[PDB]
């Protein structure tokens, strides 16, 4: 089934180039035909050269027939070069355009609502899905696919023209095919197995390495030299055998098939001479046939060598195509033209009997019903990480709940446009990763220039931008401190200036002074907008207008800090850390 | 030279591999000579000679076949041997560096040049033994033999090699000129994909995803032009090569007719001659391709060379030292990442805290007590012995230093705890845990101390990470312990417990405490203050409450 899936993958993109992809078939057919009768003409040419010689012995002919056949052969070779020119160029052009199309296709599909895929699959695996499989397809189409097609066409043509030329000699010369194909299948299969094992083992090794070469500081402090080197050496010994086998069986194929070509030309020589001396008396025709068949054997195993070599590329390519097809069948889940395009929240945000979890079984939250008002804010706290952080995931409708409703004024999240939603509501997430370019790009992530100054001042970070060289124009993509990443994220959100804001525990790794700077940044963020906040350090948002506390996704208490402390509860216990 | 320096170990297999290469080449170069001989015998009609030459030819063909397998297997043996040896040597060098020498390069740079380059050079040397040495001897042998068999055609060989050299020059220019840029662009595409993916949360948080897609599509579009250019280059050269070879063969057939008058046996040569001619064309083109690919090998070997050769910042000196007395003193120290004129002294059985401006070498001065850094000016003597005088054995077995960041390694937590002491029994293990107040927390795990830990340690949160780190620090019960703001992430419930536990194991112990939180420092007997490389003063919490101005603008918080 994998072959069919990969073929469908290719088809989906190659459809848009049908006429050219069909014309190249005629081009290659003509090219192979011309390249396949060339040995016939060179053989006839040497035959006529022998005839010219024997005439020179007594007659001294005008070599007119020889000259004519050389004319034919030279013209055919030139036109062969022309055919190669044309189909190579056209194939390259179509491959380039198709590769661009499918690369943009993978990207576009990625930026659909496949949020669940990223949520479940580890980052490394999904990045691999791209950088290994699609790049393998790219390499295959760049160099692999044309080789196999050209070579198989050459193979069929040369077989047909052998049988048109001679019967017994060709029926014998191809007799080496079963041995060669057995060699190829065995070696390539064992190479696949052993190289996969080698890749696994070297992955384990380089993972051990990566981790040690990252933590070496503690090693130096405590002198773990001997133990770490011993473990590295043991894994190195394992990969020693692994890579020995893998490398040998990977590199064996090409020389093995070359030697097979040697023995093939040898055996065809043997039968050619035997037929020539013991068979037809017309030695001139005999030797012409012999040299012709030598050329044929070379041009026959060249396809076999090329296809066998490209087998490794193409098989892995089609497996990667299977993976990309699995991706391409993932539901986009984009919302339709739902009509409603929110322009202003109206300041009546709330939740209604919300039940949700990563998957329907064992929901992490149940019956969540909270409301928020004009420029108001709500403080949240409960079980660490999941169980409380998840509610935000629904607030942006990253996921969609099975049942229960959330709205900003009556209208449920399912109603309005996703784009308008994301535009009108901002989110700040713990890690707060950055992007390529300059800090100006990261703040803009927008069609705004001077608003960055106001935002950075509001983000209490402007001093830090001006501190660096060329200020906002400082390229970045490392070399940047921790809290300032979150500060940049806050600045980004405020320049977005959405109606509603949601923030997590922004004080994950920061000092008290940076914490206070983050706090005044919060004040700036909340001062003008309604906002939710997830807080584990209660001191951060002690001045919350209203406070919510969660059991494992169930609201258990609510109210003001003073209300929630004069009212005995889990909130007071948590506060009692101070 | 480094590759051969290492391969001296496998020269024994290298020689046999090269001999295998040689035999393969000589067989492949004779078989067309024997082709000429046999079809010449057909011309001369010697049945017994025909049979003898045929059997010789098939035998030599099989000999070349087996030469192929032996060549590849032993070339692989040498290649893997050199790769393993060089990776091991580099790993040893890395582990023998000083922390500064490690800082000379980024961890990503270390890992990439340690894993990608090593395999790149392994594959390169594989191709080198299996292929490279084949091309030059193949080329010269084909040249000389073809000259021998058809001397009158000597010039056409020169013409063909000239033409192929011309087109190969065009390639060696344009293809590289475009290969560098397309490699950079393909790397750029993967980089932007990485950045977008990890940010998918924020990217989808904004409609800017559409513009990000437009940017990615633009970049791919520039990639398209270069890809089309290189495709055109293929479509020009490959037809160009095939055309030149075919034209040379046909010209060989055509011009030989001008000399057959006085010698017809040249009919016998012509076929083997064209075979040799195609052979030499293929040999030169593949040699050019492999020479071009050799540039990456050159870059990789250059990159690995410097890391291999670089010497450390710290060195052994003279004799192993006595047991550390337990005192620490500074003598007008200076350092550049930074520090200058630093001086202070603390005696056995005392506690002191350090505080300074954020980012103003948050922990570097403390990091200097470990010899991983060296005082550029001045000196420090710990226990009355200078850093230049002490040897690493005593430092580790008498001093410890919790890093500014928590670090864990794959496997079990028990081994990571054992990092501090090789033979720390379990009993000492839970003693350290209780000192860090982790016994119950660890008990909550699947097994406990032997429970597993992720490679990145993502199955535990930051607080218990700090706790594990401090346990590792205290397991050895060293005379000197350095505590660096380990309380700045966990819950504000166990800082009192950890400081209290330190306040009972303090016997015969002196510790340095670093943090921006004076709260954890108030329990310190003494305190030192620093500001951007300048020592502010020495004293105590209450005394500095009025003595120095820097105290107040942190104390108010």
């Amino acid at each position, epitope marked *: 089934t994998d072959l069919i899936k990969a073929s469908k993958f290719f088809y989906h993109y190659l459809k848009r180039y049908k006429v050219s992809f069909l014309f190249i078939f005629l081009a290659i057919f003509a090219a192979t035909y011309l390249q396949v009768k060339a040995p016939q003409f060179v053989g006839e040419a040497i035959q006529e050269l022998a005839k010219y*010689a*024997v005439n020179v012995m007594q007659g001294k002919d005008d070599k007119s027939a020889f000259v004519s056949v050389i004319w034919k052969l030279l013209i055919f070779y030139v036109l062969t070069s022309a055919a190669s020119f044309i189909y190579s160029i056209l194939f390259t052009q179509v491959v380039g355009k198709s590769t661009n199309r499918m690369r943009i296709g993978l990207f576009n599909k990625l930026e659909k609502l496949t949020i669940r895929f990223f949520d479940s699959h580890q980052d490394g695996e999904i990045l691999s899905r791209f950088t290994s499989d699609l790049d393998n397809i790219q390499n295959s189409l760049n160099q692999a696919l044309l080789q196999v097609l050209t070579n198989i066409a050459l193979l069929v043509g040369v077989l047909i023209m052998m049988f048109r030329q001679n019967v017994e000699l060709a029926w014998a010369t191809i007799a080496s095919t079963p041995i060669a194909i057995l060699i190829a299948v065995f070696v390539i299969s064992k190479a696949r197995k052993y190289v996969d094992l080698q890749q696994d083992e070297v992955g384990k090794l380089n993972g051990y390495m990566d981790e040690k070469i990252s933590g070496q500081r503690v090693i130096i402090t405590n002198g773990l030299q001997e133990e770490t080197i011993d473990g590295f050496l043991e894994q190195n010994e394992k990969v020693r055998a692994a890579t020995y086998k893998g490398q040998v069986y990977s590199g064996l194929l090409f020389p093995m098939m070359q030697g097979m070509s040697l023995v093939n030309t040898a055996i065809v020589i043997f039968f050619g001479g035997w037929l020539a001396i013991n068979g037809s008396v017309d*030695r001139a025709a005999a030797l012409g046939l012999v040299v012709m068949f030598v050329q044929y054997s070379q041009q026959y195993y060249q396809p076999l060598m090329q296809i066998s070599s490209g087998y490794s590329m193409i098989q892995l390519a089609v497996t990667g195509a299977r993976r990309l097809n699995e991706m391409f069948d993932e539901p986009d889940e984009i919302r339709p033209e739902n009509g409603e395009k929110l322009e202003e929240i109206n300041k009546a945000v709330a939740l209604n009997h919300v039940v949700f979890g990563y998957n329907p079984e064992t929901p992490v939250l149940k019956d969540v019903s909270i409301h928020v008002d004009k420029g108001e804010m709500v403080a949240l706290v409960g079980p660490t990480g999941s169980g409380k952080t998840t509610i935000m995931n629904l607030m942006n409708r990253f996921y969609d709940v099975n049942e229960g409703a959330v709205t900003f004024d009556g209208v449920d999240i399912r109603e309005m446009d996703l784009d308008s939603l994301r535009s009108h509501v901002g989110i700040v997430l713990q890690e707060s990763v950055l992007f390529s370019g300059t800090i100006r790009e990261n703040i803009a992530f927008e069609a705004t220039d001077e608003e960055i100054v106001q935002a950075a001042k509001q983000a209490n970070i402007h001093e830090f931008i001006v501190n660096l060289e060329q200020g906002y124009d400082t390229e970045i993509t490392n070399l940047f401190s921790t809290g300032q990443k979150q500060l940049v994220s806050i600045a980004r959100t405020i320049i977005t200036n959405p109606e509603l804001l949601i923030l997590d525990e922004a004080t994950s790794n920061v000092d008290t002074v940076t914490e206070a700077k983050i706090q005044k940044a919060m004040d700036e963020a909340i001062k003008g907008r309604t906002s939710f906040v997830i807080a584990h350090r209660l001191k951060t948002i002690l001045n919350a207008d209203r406070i919510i506390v969660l059991r494992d996704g169930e609201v258990i208490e609510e109210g003001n800090h003073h209300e929630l402390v004069e009212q005995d509860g889990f909130y007071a216990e948590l506060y009692k850390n101070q | 030279d480094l590759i051969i320096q290492h391969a001296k170990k496998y020269k024994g297999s290298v020689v046999i591999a090269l001999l295998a290469v040689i035999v393969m080449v000589v067989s492949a170069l004779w078989q067309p000579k024997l082709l000429q001989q046999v079809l010449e015998a057909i011309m*001369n009609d*010697d049945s017994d*000679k025909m049979k003898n030459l045929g059997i010789q030819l098939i035998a030599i063909a099989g000999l070349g076949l087996v030469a192929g397998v032996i060549n590849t297997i032993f070339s692989a043996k040498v290649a893997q041997g050199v790769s393993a040896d060089i990776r091991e040597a580099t790993f040893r060098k890395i582990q023998t560096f000083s922390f500064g020498n490690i800082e000379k390069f980024s961890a990503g740079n270390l890992v990439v040049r340690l894993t990608n380059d090593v395999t790149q050079i392994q594959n390169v040397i594989m191709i080198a033994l299996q292929t490279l040495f084949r091309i030059p001897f193949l080329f010269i042998g084909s040249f000389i033999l073809a000259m021998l068999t058809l001397p009158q055609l000597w010039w056409v060989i020169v013409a063909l090699v000239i033409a192929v050299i011309l087109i190969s020059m065009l390639s060696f220019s344009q293809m590289g000129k475009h290969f560098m840029i397309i490699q950079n662009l393909i790397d750029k595409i993967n980089g932007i994909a990485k950045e977008n993916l990890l940010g998918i949360r924020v990217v989808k948080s904004f409609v800017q995803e559409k513009n990000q897609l437009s940017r990615f599509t633009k970049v791919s579009e520039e990639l398209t032009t270069h890809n089309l250019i290189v495709g055109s280059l293929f479509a020009v050269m490959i037809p160009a090569f095939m055309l030149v070879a075919n034209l040379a063969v046909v010209g060989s057939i055509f011009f030989v007719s001008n000399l057959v008058k006085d010698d017809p046996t040249l009919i016998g040569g012509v076929a083997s001659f064209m075979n040799y001619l195609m052979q030499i064309m293929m040999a030169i083109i593949i040699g050019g391709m492999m020479m071009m690919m050799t540039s990456r090998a050159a870059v990789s070997i250059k990159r690995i060379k410097e890391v291999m050769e670089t010497e450390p910042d710290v060195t052994y000196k003279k004799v192993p030292e006595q047991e550390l007395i337990g005192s620490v003193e500074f003598d007008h120290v200076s350092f550049r990442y930074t520090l200058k004129d630093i001086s202070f002294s603390i005696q056995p059985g005392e506690m002191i805290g350090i505080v300074g401006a954020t980012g103003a070498g948050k922990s570097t001065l403390a990091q200097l007590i470990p010899r991983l850094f060296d005082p550029t000016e001045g000196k420090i003597e710990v226990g009355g012995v200078d850093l230049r005088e002490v040897n690493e054995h005593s430092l580790r077995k008498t001093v410890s230093f919790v890093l500014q960041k928590a670090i864990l390694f794959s496997g079990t937590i028990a081994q990571n705890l054992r990092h501090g002491k090789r033979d720390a029994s379990e009993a000492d293990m839970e003693r350290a845990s209780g000192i860090a107040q982790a016994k119950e927390f660890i008990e909550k795990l699947a097994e406990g101390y032997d429970a597993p830990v992720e490679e990145r340690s993502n199955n535990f949160s930051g607080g218990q990470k700090q706790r594990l780190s401090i346990t590792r620090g205290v397991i050895g019960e060293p005379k000197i312990l350095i505590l660096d703001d380990s309380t700045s992430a966990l819950d504000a419930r166990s800082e009192r417990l950890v400081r209290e536990a330190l306040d009972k194991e303090l016997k015969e112990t002196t510790t340095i405490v670093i943090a921006q939180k004076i709260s954890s420092v108030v329990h310190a007997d003494r305190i030192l203050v620093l500001d951007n490389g300048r020592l502010v003063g020495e004293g105590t919490h209450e005394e500095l409450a009025a003595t120095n101005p820097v105290y107040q603008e942190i104390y108010e918080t």
Partner: nanobody
Amino acid sequence: QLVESGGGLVQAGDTLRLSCEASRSFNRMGWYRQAPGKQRDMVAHIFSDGRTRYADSVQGRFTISRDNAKNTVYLQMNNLKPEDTAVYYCNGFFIQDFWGQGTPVTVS
């Protein structure tokens, strides 16, 4: 082209050395014969190197020789019998069988 001399009247039991020369041509040579009314048929062959092969009818009696210095060939008739009477030719060729005019020998 070729040239052969030596043939003539002989008796059953006589000895005659045939001698043929090539027009600057270097070849594997051999002698053929034609009995009156019979087809051209092989008699013996001498390889360019120097080794040879004879027809059973003449095996053990007739001897062939050549001189590579000039590509001349010889064949020693000896112990003749009446059936040996025929016209003989010297042959040396590459593809098309070059043969000389040949000469007759009559075994009386």
